Design a protein around this motif. Structure first.
Motif, mmCIF file in Angstrom:
data_model
loop_
_atom_site.group_PDB
_atom_site.id
_atom_site.type_symbol
_atom_site.label_atom_id
_atom_site.label_comp_id
_atom_site.label_asym_id
_atom_site.label_seq_id
_atom_site.Cartn_x
_atom_site.Cartn_y
_atom_site.Cartn_z
ATOM 1 N N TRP A 32 -12.849 -4.321 15.335
ATOM 2 C CA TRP A 32 -13.168 -5.623 15.162
ATOM 3 C C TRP A 32 -12.820 -6.342 13.815
ATOM 4 O O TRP A 32 -12.526 -7.309 13.742
ATOM 5 C CB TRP A 32 -14.604 -5.687 15.653
ATOM 6 N N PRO A 33 -12.914 -5.443 12.706
ATOM 7 C CA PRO A 33 -12.465 -6.122 11.409
ATOM 8 C C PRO A 33 -11.001 -6.769 11.376
ATOM 9 O O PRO A 33 -10.665 -7.776 10.681
ATOM 10 C CB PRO A 33 -12.517 -4.925 10.548
ATOM 11 N N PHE A 34 -10.027 -6.087 12.432
ATOM 12 C CA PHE A 34 -8.723 -6.331 12.263
ATOM 13 C C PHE A 34 -8.216 -7.485 13.228
ATOM 14 O O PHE A 34 -7.106 -7.582 13.495
ATOM 15 C CB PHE A 34 -7.960 -4.975 12.550
ATOM 16 N N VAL A 86 -7.891 -11.597 7.451
ATOM 17 C CA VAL A 86 -9.077 -11.401 6.458
ATOM 18 C C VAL A 86 -9.370 -12.645 5.478
ATOM 19 O O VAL A 86 -8.525 -13.368 5.336
ATOM 20 C CB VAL A 86 -8.575 -10.259 5.491
ATOM 21 N N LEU A 97 -15.963 -13.752 2.919
ATOM 22 C CA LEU A 97 -16.114 -12.541 2.632
ATOM 23 C C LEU A 97 -16.119 -12.036 0.851
ATOM 24 O O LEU A 97 -16.545 -11.023 0.535
ATOM 25 C CB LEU A 97 -15.020 -11.419 3.259
ATOM 26 N N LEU A 131 -13.908 -11.929 -1.412
ATOM 27 C CA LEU A 131 -13.029 -10.947 -1.872
ATOM 28 C C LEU A 131 -11.752 -11.879 -2.741
ATOM 29 O O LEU A 131 -11.013 -12.402 -2.339
ATOM 30 C CB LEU A 131 -11.962 -10.143 -0.777
ATOM 31 N N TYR A 161 -8.275 -10.127 -3.755
ATOM 32 C CA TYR A 161 -7.729 -9.868 -2.465
ATOM 33 C C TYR A 161 -6.264 -10.116 -2.440
ATOM 34 O O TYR A 161 -5.362 -9.530 -2.224
ATOM 35 C CB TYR A 161 -8.345 -10.055 -1.128
ATOM 36 N N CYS A 197 -5.306 -2.538 4.221
ATOM 37 C CA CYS A 197 -6.789 -1.663 4.140
ATOM 38 C C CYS A 197 -6.835 -0.743 3.245
ATOM 39 O O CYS A 197 -7.605 -0.699 2.468
ATOM 40 C CB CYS A 197 -7.210 -1.686 5.365
ATOM 41 N N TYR A 211 -6.121 -1.799 -0.384
ATOM 42 C CA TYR A 211 -7.412 -2.402 -1.137
ATOM 43 C C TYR A 211 -8.424 -1.668 -1.269
ATOM 44 O O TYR A 211 -9.250 -2.288 -2.540
ATOM 45 C CB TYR A 211 -7.365 -3.818 -0.274
ATOM 46 N N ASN A 212 -9.060 -0.903 -0.574
ATOM 47 C CA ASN A 212 -10.353 -0.467 -0.736
ATOM 48 C C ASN A 212 -10.339 0.978 -1.002
ATOM 49 O O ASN A 212 -9.486 1.831 -0.852
ATOM 50 C CB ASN A 212 -11.135 -0.441 0.754
ATOM 51 N N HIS A 216 -14.599 3.898 1.882
ATOM 52 C CA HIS A 216 -15.196 2.996 2.429
ATOM 53 C C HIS A 216 -14.925 2.930 3.766
ATOM 54 O O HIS A 216 -13.993 3.059 4.595
ATOM 55 C CB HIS A 216 -14.604 1.578 1.779
ATOM 56 N N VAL A 260 -14.506 0.504 6.159
ATOM 57 C CA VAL A 260 -13.415 -0.192 6.808
ATOM 58 C C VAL A 260 -12.210 0.902 6.861
ATOM 59 O O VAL A 260 -11.509 0.552 7.851
ATOM 60 C CB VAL A 260 -13.237 -1.583 6.152
HETATM 61 O O1 LIG Z 1 -9.588 -4.690 3.825
HETATM 62 C C1 LIG Z 1 -10.539 -4.974 4.018
HETATM 63 C C2 LIG Z 1 -11.799 -5.045 2.968
HETATM 64 C C3 LIG Z 1 -13.033 -5.781 3.165
HETATM 65 N N1 LIG Z 1 -14.156 -5.596 2.683
HETATM 66 C C4 LIG Z 1 -15.296 -6.240 2.971
HETATM 67 C C5 LIG Z 1 -16.820 -5.511 3.133
HETATM 68 O O2 LIG Z 1 -16.606 -4.329 2.379
HETATM 69 C C6 LIG Z 1 -16.037 -4.501 1.196
HETATM 70 C C7 LIG Z 1 -14.526 -5.070 1.122
HETATM 71 O O3 LIG Z 1 -13.010 -6.427 4.593
HETATM 72 C C8 LIG Z 1 -12.080 -6.277 5.539
HETATM 73 C C9 LIG Z 1 -12.192 -6.916 6.793
HETATM 74 C C10 LIG Z 1 -13.384 -7.492 7.726
HETATM 75 C C11 LIG Z 1 -14.388 -7.436 7.354
HETATM 76 C C12 LIG Z 1 -15.819 -8.072 8.088
HETATM 77 C C13 LIG Z 1 -15.604 -8.995 8.976
HETATM 78 C C14 LIG Z 1 -14.293 -9.506 9.310
HETATM 79 C C15 LIG Z 1 -13.252 -8.830 8.539
HETATM 80 O O4 LIG Z 1 -13.761 -10.179 10.118
HETATM 81 C C16 LIG Z 1 -15.066 -10.942 10.986
HETATM 82 C C17 LIG Z 1 -16.237 -10.891 10.147
HETATM 83 O O5 LIG Z 1 -16.727 -9.927 9.709
HETATM 84 C C18 LIG Z 1 -10.751 -6.608 7.604
HETATM 85 S S1 LIG Z 1 -9.844 -5.669 6.541
HETATM 86 C C19 LIG Z 1 -11.016 -5.891 5.397
#
Ligand SMILES: O=c1cc(N2CCOCC2)oc2c(-c3ccc4c(c3)OCCO4)csc12
Length: 109
Positions: free
Chosen positions: A26-28, A32, A37, A39, A42, A81, A84-85, A89, A91
């Motif tokens: 679902w995050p993908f 983003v 969010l 970031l 980002y 992903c 970045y993280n 983590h 995700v």
């Molecule tokens: O690379 C990424 C890094 C992060 N984060 C956020 C939380 O933790 C710390 C950094 O977020 C994402 C997402 C994502 C996350 C949450 C969502 C979302 C998409 O779309 C629908 C609503 O909720 C997708 S790739 C990604």
């Protein structure tokens, strides 16, 4: 042929959207959203964002010449992903679970 390859790419993308995978997929689904969010770094780190809905849109207008251009965008979505993280983590673990599904279908195309 390139046409059958791209029919198969659409089917792999379709499976990535299926309910079976929604727990880690679902995050993908959508690009983003750095405002919703929080970031702020980002767009500094990730110079080429990618997501499943954008890949579907590019597919549905043939921006992809063959299966390899499709696959490069899928892997770019995962690379962003991973890049970045922190590697521990949540995700990242979810991206890895989805990539293992992608690479299996991609290899067996
Ligand atoms: O690379 C990424 C890094 C992060 N984060 C956020 C939380 O933790 C710390 C950094 O977020 C994402 C997402 C994502 C996350 C949450 C969502 C979302 C998409 O779309 C629908 C609503 O909720 C997708 S790739 C990604």
């Amino acid at each position: 042929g390139p046409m059958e390859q791209l029919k198969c790419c659409s089917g792999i993308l379709k499976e990535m959207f299926a309910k079976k995978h929604a727990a880690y997929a679902w995050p993908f689904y959508k690009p983003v959203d750095v405002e919703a969010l929080g970031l702020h770094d980002y767009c500094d780190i990730i110079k080429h964002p990618m997501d499943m809905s954008t890949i579907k849109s590019k597919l549905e207008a043939r921006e992809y010449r063959d299966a390899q251009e499709f696959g490069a965008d899928v892997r770019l979505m995962f690379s962003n992903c991973y890049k970045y993280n922190p590697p521990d983590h949540e995700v990242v673990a979810m991206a890895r679970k989805l990539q293992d599904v992608f690479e299996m279908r991609f290899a067996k195309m």
